[PDB]
Amino acid sequence: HMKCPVCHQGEMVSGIKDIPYTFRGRKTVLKGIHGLYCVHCEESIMNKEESDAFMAQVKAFRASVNAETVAPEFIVKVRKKLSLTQKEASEIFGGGVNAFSRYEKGNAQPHPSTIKLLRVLDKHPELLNEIR
Amino acid sequence: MKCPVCHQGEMVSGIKDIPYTFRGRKTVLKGIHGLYCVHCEESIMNKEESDAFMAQVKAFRASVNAETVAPEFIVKVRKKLSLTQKEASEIFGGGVNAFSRYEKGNAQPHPSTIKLLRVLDKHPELLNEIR
Ligand SMILES: [Zn+2]
Ligand SMILES: [Zn+2]
């Protein structure tokens, strides 16, 4: 019987839980996480091994988001390579009104498909007619 | 003639740009001839004027509607790329169950995913660039 050291009310019981996690505007569920969990406030306590498993999953998610994400500077370059204004690019690639104005200030993440479309248009500027 | 809606304004012949929203998409219908109330902007359009107006309304509805892709088309492109739905979901985005719902018609892909799938339908080899 260990009492939760955060809420000081509930009991910590060992279990396996799926943990929601958001990083750089991307969401995931960290699946099958072993640890002690407070029945009252859901605070988690992980031993050395459990923490290793958890952090490997967290860091694999971060690595993948970072590799997929593109710099504001890349977005501008691809847009300028296509001689598009921010408004035309938002319309052509997607994202809504002011999408590219926000993307280029580093103030928003494009949808994964917008990023990928940008990556393809970077290498294939001739495809612009197919998407406009 | 007095305006038949507000009863406190004269209807005058003119031309106006009329904003119009359809399925949450906004446009301005340009150069619409009609009688317009000076007070409340109620419009009265004769047959000929209504046909012109409705032809713009309908051309805008049709282009908005046509942005949607047949779920059949989504299956066509996916099979074509030798991808499962789990993989497509991971590649194109939308979430864990994305592509299963698209092909049942229970969800619409993001506009960029549609564009990316239309591009890939014509040039399926480019997947290897963004996989
Ligand atoms: Zn607690
Ligand atoms: Zn009136």
Numbering used by the authors:
A (entry chain A): 0 to 131
B (entry chain B): 1 to 131
According to the publication:
Our biochemical and structural analysis of the E. coli MqsA antitoxin and the MqsR:MqsA-N complex provide a detailed 3-dimensional structural view of the free antitoxin and the TA complex. These structures combined with our biochemical data unequivocally demonstrate that MqsR, a protein previously shown to be critical for biofilm formation and the most highly upregulated gene in persister cells in E. coli, and MqsA form a novel bacterial TA system. Our data show that, as expected for a TA system, the expression of the MqsR toxin leads to growth arrest, while co-expression with its antitoxin, MqsA, rescues the growth arrest phenotype. In addition, MqsR associates with MqsA to form a tight, non-toxic complex and both MqsA alone and the MqsR:MqsA2:MqsR complex bind and regulate the mqsR promoter. MqsA itself is a two-domain protein with a novel fold that, unlike every other antitoxin, is well-ordered throughout its entire sequence and whose structure does not change upon toxin binding.
